[PDB]
Amino acid sequence: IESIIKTATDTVKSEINAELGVVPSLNAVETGATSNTEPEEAIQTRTVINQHGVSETLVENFLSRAALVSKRSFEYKDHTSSTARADKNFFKWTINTRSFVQLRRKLELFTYLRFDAEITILTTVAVNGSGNNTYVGLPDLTLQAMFVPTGALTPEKQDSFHWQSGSNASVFFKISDPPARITIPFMCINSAYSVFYDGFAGFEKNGLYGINPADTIGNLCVRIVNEHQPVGFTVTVRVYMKPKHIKAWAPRPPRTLPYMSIANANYKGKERAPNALSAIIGNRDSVKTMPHNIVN
Amino acid sequence: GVPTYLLPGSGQFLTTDDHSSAPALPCFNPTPEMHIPGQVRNMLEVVQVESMMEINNTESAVGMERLKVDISALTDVDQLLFNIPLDIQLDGPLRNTLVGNISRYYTHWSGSLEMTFMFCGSFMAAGKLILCYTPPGGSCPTTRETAMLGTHIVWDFGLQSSVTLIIPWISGSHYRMFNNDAKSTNANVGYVTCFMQTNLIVPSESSDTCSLIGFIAAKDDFSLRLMRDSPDIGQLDHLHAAEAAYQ
Amino acid sequence: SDRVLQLKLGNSAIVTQEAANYCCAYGEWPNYLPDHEAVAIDKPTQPETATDRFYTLKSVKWETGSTGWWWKLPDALNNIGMFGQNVQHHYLYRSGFLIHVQCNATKFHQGALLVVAIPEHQRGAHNTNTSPGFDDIMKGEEGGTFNHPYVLDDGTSLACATIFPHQWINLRTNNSATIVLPWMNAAPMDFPLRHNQWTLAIIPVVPLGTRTTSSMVPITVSIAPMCCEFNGLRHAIT
Amino acid sequence: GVPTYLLPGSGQFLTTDDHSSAPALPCFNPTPEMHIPGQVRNMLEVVQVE
């Protein structure tokens, strides 16, 4: 029965039942169907006109909430003597949604998802305290965020030609400005994203497992447009993503064990319960014990 | 030009705001929609599906052993078999259920529940049980005489291997809450107990210990509100390979 | 008995006298790809009776320390009959599956099986950061066993696995389970050798027990491909 | 875009201003209203009691 549900269903009054051949409270779990027993059939009920709305559990409302997807700190300074491992006034991030547990677990409640993303970038700056540096003050810098799709070259320096962005989508924003905000469409080459992928990425046997090639996004390169200054600073960029226009398919069991990696669904659990490999739920003394027993 | 003035809340980023933002890729054509089985439009459809209760959440129970309750033949009448703490908002048998998992993302809940039990003995093992729900206010009943006074179902093993006990919405307030105070008047739901209405009688060639599986689900009466962060997932450090995304 | 059912599907057939019902995943039936959802412009091959038929896999022994078994589709059916030949000679396929799990015992036997079809059951490893390898995932007709059936081998819970299309084999009640799975995928077609749409898992939630004479109790699995299509014909690649 | 200019009193928080602000909890359904005795709609009803 497909219908429009805006409120919880009402209750109807019921009377004494004693009829042969009818056993509403008896079910068959083996069929794979949930019990269809009604409260009106198990107890004697009254008429209740239920006015509880159900708009808060809509998948759109459930998932349309900005969540931290990226957070990166780098030093904005003179990087002449820095090693070839630090972010020299810029960084690149391979976009993914598996780095922060809250959004990952919310998204992984479904097998397939189709949505547009709303990207918000929030930048903070702090004055470096290394050595004998003082507060000085916080400069108002300009940052450039460029989206490099798959196959496009990514910048290697803070002043490389790639930043001219002839066709790549870039956003220039100040720290004193509100957080930058854009919208990315549903970029999948399929009709929906694959939250879980029971396959391998390549045509050979050495490809990655569990990552769908169709769901590849690209890179987000963030640089400071300003040239360095006599004193060093630490710039932290946070990227939040909000799904919208969502369609969800095949809900899944929630994850109980802590996440181990962003590349796979590997599990080891906690040392003791709750959420341990051998005991998800915390233990009680026996099946005849309740911990929070009201005693008076 | 138009004369204007900015209000409080101007330039601030509320993570639950609902506006339209700039399309970064103009004229982009998304992939055509194709029909996929099993679409979900409300999260109340998921909670309505029944899932196993971890009633045997005790030490010496490992893995799947925690998902079934063993019942043997007793030599005394009216004996208590087990009880289920009805605290979804706290760690217990109902915590790792579809209804429990989805409800722990919200603060307020309302509606009725159904608790189904499937008997998994042999064809010619017989018995009668009594499943009782006790509205809150007092201690958990320990005897069948006290337990029968609440809501209950007498279950007779037969061709239908499963029975249902309805935990109806009997609340004073209009909703209930997660509190972390199980004894709070706005959170406590009552108790569920199982007693022997008769004994479990099996022949010599049948196993003398049989097993029950418990499931719980929500009805159409169910409703949730005041979405929050689920306390079931955390993060103490960066996940493996997370930093490699910047290399 | 509790219910009777017959499943023809080609030149094969199955009769069950002790069944509960059969499950249609999400209340849907397999069908051929329509013109308004097609992608590949090549004319497909629809063998029908040659491929849409029951294939029976090797049986597995139902012991006391059994943790469960899984078979990934179409990986399990690849290399089996005309369906396997069509998979090897073609680059894309598309098919539903009618799955029948068989297990019988005596009336002095107890035990409960959960038979669940997980869509896109991406597995995880235990106590390691490395991802599962090719040999860990691709087991063929023999399938695999569950390392930790408690968490479904992916860090989730077995208790919530009833959200997926499933049935039970309760020895006290029935001896067979039937699930009808339509085409489940984000794409209209797919390469059969690198991705599995479905995983059939049979898990012993209630262990097998009896006090009569012990006998070998096997579990048999028969999968019938349904509405099979194939595109991208070239040499066999296996 | 629309050409605009800010007026005096822009960005200032008057505690008696009457505007609409962002709903922090979207799609929230408040509890249904029930009749309670003794509703007060004007404070002049209270002063009229001796």
Partner: peptide, 30 residues
């Protein structure tokens, strides 16, 4: 709400889909 953008995906969340079919997960039998 306002959506003066030329692309339709730039609009705000569409929280008005109140149709549902729970029976595809609760009674997926015949």
């Amino acid at each position: 709400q306002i959506n003066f953008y030329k692309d339709s995906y730039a609009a705000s969340a569409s929280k008005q889909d109140f149709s549902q079919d729970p029976s595809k997960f609760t009674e997926p039998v015949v």
